[PDB]
Amino acid sequence: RGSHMCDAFVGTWKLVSSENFDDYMKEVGVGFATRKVAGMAKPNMIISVNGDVITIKSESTFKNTEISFILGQEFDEVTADDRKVKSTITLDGGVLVHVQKWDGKSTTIKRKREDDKLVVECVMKGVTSTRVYERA
Ligand SMILES: O=C(O)c1ccccc1Nc1cccc(Cl)c1-c1ccc2c(c1)CCO2
Numbered sequence: 013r014g015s016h017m018c019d020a021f022v023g024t025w026k027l028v029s030s031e032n033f034d035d036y037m038k039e040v041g042v043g044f045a046t047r048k049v050a051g052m053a054k055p056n057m058i059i060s061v062n063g064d065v066i067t068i069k070s071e072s073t074f075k076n077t078e079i080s081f082i083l084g085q086e087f088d089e090v091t092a093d094d095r096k097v098k099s100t101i102t103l104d105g106g107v108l109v110h111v112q113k114w115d116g117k118s119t120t121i122k123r124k125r126e127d128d129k130l131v132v133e134c135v136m137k138g139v140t141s142t143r144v145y146e147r148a
Contacts, residue, residue, distance in 0.1 A: 021066075026055075031141060036135075036136055036141035039139040042093045046094075053072035055071060056070070065082060066083070070092070077090075079099070084102050086100045095114050097112040098112070099111065106124065107122050108123040110123070119134065119135065129146055
């Protein structure tokens with residue numbers, strides 16, 4: 013197997029900045045205690061690609077989570093805040109677009125490479141949070 017464009021995401025990343033994450037979590041429906049503990053976390057994200065399977069691991073003092081998926085193919089995901097969601101992740105012009113559906117609700121998480129950073133934009137009903145990761 014040769015290189016893939018998505019290899020640009022592969023590596024070990026650490027959170028360096030976060031904006032509006034509490035408001036994003038409020039819009040998602042996260043309860044008070046989870047919002048406070050999750051908002052304190054400074055996760056590391058580990059992204060790897062093996063064939064068609066992309067794996068994203070998140071490790072923090074709050075929770076450790078992992079998803080593996082194939083682009084375009086829906087999967088079950090239990091989120092760090094304990095939502096059971098149906099997820100589909102696709103690549104749109106270099107951006108990983110992750111849609112989560114649950115309880116008649118929907119949120120979109122976009123992950124993109126900007127300069128040497130990995131920028132994560134979380135969007136729910138007009139509320140956006142931007143989380144910036146740098147190489148660990
Ligand atoms: O956090 C990110 O950048 C992030 C990116 C893409 C997608 C989700 C992300 N985070 C969260 C989103 C909603 C609710 C929670 Cl609770 C978290 C979270 C908050 C802290 C935490 C974890 C998850 C796992 C490791 O620690």
